[PDB]
Amino acid sequence: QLKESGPGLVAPSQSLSITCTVSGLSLPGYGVNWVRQPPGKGLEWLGMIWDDGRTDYNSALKSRLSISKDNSKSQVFLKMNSLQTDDTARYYCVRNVYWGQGTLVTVSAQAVVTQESALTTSPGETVTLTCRSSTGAVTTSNYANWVQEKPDHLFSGLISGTNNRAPGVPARFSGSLIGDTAALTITGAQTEDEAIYFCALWYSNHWVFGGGSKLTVLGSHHHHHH
CATH code: domain of residue 167? 2.60.40.10
Last residue of a domain, one of 55, 73, 107: 107
Residue 174 and residue 120 in one domain: yes
DSSP string spanning 200-218?
EEE-SS-EEE---EEEEE-
The DSSP symbol for 17 reads E
**225, part of any domain:** no
Residues 192-219: b if buried by 16+ CB within 10 A, e if exposed: ebbbbbbbbbeeeebbbbbebbebebee
d(CA 111, CA 21): 31
Residue 27 and residue 98 in one domain: yes
Neighbours of 54 (CB within 10 A): 10
Question: At 145, phi and psi to the nearest 5?
Answer: -120, 135
Residues in Cβ contact with 157 at an 8 Å cutoff, skipping those fewer than 6 apart: 94, 96, 97, 98, 99, 145, 146, 147, 148, 166, 169
Q: Give Cα 226 to chain centroid, integer Å.
A: 42
Residues in Cβ contact with 72 at an 8 Å cutoff, skipping those fewer than 6 apart: none
Residue 96 and residue 122 in one domain: no
Residue 149 and residue 194 in one domain: yes
The answer to whether residues 34 and 47 touch, using CB atoms and an 8 Å cutoff, is yes
**219, part of any domain:** no
Last residue of a domain, one of 48, 78, 107: 107
Do the bridges between strand 154-160 and strand 164-165 make them parallel or antiparallel, or are there none, so unpaired? Answer: antiparallel
Helices and strands, number each (H, E), in the chain: 0, 22
In Å, how far are 32, 82, 126, 156 from 199, measured between CA atoms?
17, 30, 18, 12
Resolution (Å) of this entry: 1.5
Determination technique for this PDB entry? Answer: X-ray
Reduce the DSSP state of residue 20 to 3 states and report it.
strand
Residue 6 and residue 20 in one domain: yes
The radius of gyration of the chain from alpha carbons, rounded to an integer in Å, stands at: 18
Domains held by the chain: number:
2
